[PDB]
């Protein structure tokens, strides 16, 4: 399970940026996991 520690919204909304190797919350723009 992977959740944003600032929006605190369930279920979390998440978009994976494959071309940058990142996982990004779609609301605050925060970067969750890299590489």
């Amino acid at each position: 399970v992977l959740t944003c520690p600032e929006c605190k919204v369930y279920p979390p909304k998440i978009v994976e940026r494959f071309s940058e190797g990142d996982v990004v919350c779609a609301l605050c723009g925060l970067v969750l996991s890299d590489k």
Partner: protein, 49 residues
């Protein structure tokens, strides 16, 4: 699950795009779906539906 960021809107009901549509970067032109057995779970990624 594991949908791609490309725009699925241009696909028809058949799952195949139709001639004469300006495709672009990272769009999809063929829609392919794989059934999965219930005992196969992506380590908690899969949901009920």
């Amino acid at each position: 699950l594991r949908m791609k960021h490309g725009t699925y809107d241009k696909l028809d009901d058949d799952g195949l795009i139709a001639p004469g549509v300006r495709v672009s970067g990272e769009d999809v032109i063929i829609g392919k779906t794989t059934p999965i057995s219930p005992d196969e779970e992506e380590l908690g990624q899969r949901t009920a539906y």
